[PDB]
């Protein structure tokens, strides 16, 4: 089963954008497809739904009349068109997926879409060391600062380096642009013996920077 | 449109004791017809989509273990884990589907109770690359400690700072039911050479006193 999500990202009110999850390696027309969104921090709102053969559309109240969900089930794909965007739309936008009326219980493919409403303009990350000093347990980082909008992504060693890193919650400075770190705890015998790298990377910008942290 | 209501908000039970969550429809959700309980449970781990737990308000999904039950009947419906494990902490939704929209629960944020863990705390200074574009970041990280409540103070040559830092605080572990901290004191170039002493000076309940790290500008 592969799934490939796209659209979303920055878009300013008033405008559109347009949402697909495709897929292979189930029956795409042995389901009821669903779109569910999740402003960030808080919860889980039934969007819209559409039956195998597109036959019956529901949306809820929140999005009637400015939303369009539609399918193509040769394509294998599930499309949501969405027009006259307001600050609330902001969610994370995800793909679901129901059998029939003897078991309409959610089935999600496919990880969520970010979609950011607002006027501010796009900034790419500034990414800077925080550089390990001098039991012998020594913490590093990156501190990815003053960008927008959400999100970015912070691998270690291109993906090699997942055990001990805690990647931060991006928290909006007073500024208007976000700003998080990313840090790692390693045994301090291997601090010159092994090299570290923040792999930052922020789609809205197309900033891709991979930062090197050494100590001083 | 049917309306969700879960109780409680958020819950905090220890590691091998029961959780018990519960979930109100505003009409009841029982087909009188096929006599089934149109009501689904799912778990929604941190930057993940929501698994299903349990169906027909009773029938557990095949993988999810023993220890999760579903009840209820109408309108009262109760999500319950027996023993919880370390791997729980999520929130947790009550679903109706007798109508559609298929309307959600509010929510509920289930969190660990473990034995309390000191902070190991470290301190970074600015990095040359960031004094050049005119601003100073320090960063204090409180790394792997419970419980949540934690108070860090910034000094700046003994003079104690406020309303220039900002906190953020990971989602708790799956593993070791732990959190980390990182406060961010933000200054300007010119007050950052000013001074010269920078401590961050961390107060949590795994602690017999205040640990305080600190670095002199300039090693």
């Known amino acids: 089963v592969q799934v490939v999500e796209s659209g979303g990202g920055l878009v300013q009110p008033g405008r559109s954008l347009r949402l697909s999850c495709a897929a292979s390696?189930?029956?795409?027309?042995?389901?009821?497809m669903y779109w569910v969104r999740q402003a960030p921090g808080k919860g889980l709102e039934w969007v819209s739904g559409?039956?195998?053969?597109?036959?019956?559309?529901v949306y809820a109240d929140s999005v009637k009349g400015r939303f369009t969900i539609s399918r193509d089930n040769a394509k294998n794909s599930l499309y949501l068109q969405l027009n006259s965007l307001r600050a609330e739309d902001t969610a994370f936008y995800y793909c679901?997926?129901?059998?029939?009326?003897?078991?309409?219980?959610?089935?999600?493919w496919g990880q969520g879409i970010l979609v950011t409403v607002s006027s501010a303009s796009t900034k790419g990350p500034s990414v800077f060391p925080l550089a390990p000093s001098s039991g012998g347990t020594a913490a590093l980082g990156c501190l990815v600062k003053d960008y927008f909008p959400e999100p970015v992504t912070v691998s270690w060693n291109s993906g090699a380096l997942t055990s001990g890193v805690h990647t931060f919650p991006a928290v909006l400075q007073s500024s208007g642009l976000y700003s998080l770190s990313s840090v790692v705890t390693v045994p301090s015998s291997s601090l010159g013996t092994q090299t570290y790298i923040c792999n930052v990377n922020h789609k809205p910008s197309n900033t891709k920077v991979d930062k090197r942290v050494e100590p001083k | 449109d049917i309306v969700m209501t879960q109780s409680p908000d958020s819950l905090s039970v220890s590691l091998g004791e029961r959780a018990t969550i519960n979930c109100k429809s505003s009409?009841?959700?029982?087909?009188?017809?096929?006599?089934?309980?149109?009501l689904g449970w799912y778990q929604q781990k941190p930057g993940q989509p929501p698994k299903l737990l349990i169906y027909?308000?009773?029938t557990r999904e095949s993988g999810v273990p023993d220890r999760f039950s579903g009840s209820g009947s109408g309108t009262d419906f109760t999500l319950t884990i027996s023993s919880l494990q370390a791997e729980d902490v999520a929130v947790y939704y009550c679903?109706?589907?007798?109508?559609?929209?298929?309307?959600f629960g509010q929510g509920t944020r289930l969190e660990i109770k473990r034995t309390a863990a000191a902070p190991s705390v470290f301190i970074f200074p600015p990095s040359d690359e960031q004094l050049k574009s005119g601003t100073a970041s320090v960063v204090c990280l409180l790394n792997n400690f419970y419980p949540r409540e934690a108070k860090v103070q910034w000094k700046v040559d003994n003079a104690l700072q406020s309303g220039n830092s900002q906190e953020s605080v990971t989602e708790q572990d799956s593993k070791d039911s732990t959190y980390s901290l990182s406060s961010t004191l933000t200054l300007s170039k010119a007050d950052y050479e000013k001074h010269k002493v920078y401590a961050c000076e961390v107060t949590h309940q795994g602690l017999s006193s205040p640990v305080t790290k600190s670095f002199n500008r300039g090693e």
């Open positions: 679901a997926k129901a059998v029939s009326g003897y078991f309409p219980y959610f089935d999600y």
């Open positions: 390696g189930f029956t795409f027309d042995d389901y009821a």
């Open positions: 559409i039956s195998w053969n597109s036959g019956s559309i």
């Open positions: 009409q009841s959700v029982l087909y009188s017809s096929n006599n089934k309980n149109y």
């Open positions: 027909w308000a009773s």
């Open positions: 679903q109706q589907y007798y109508t559609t929209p298929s309307t």
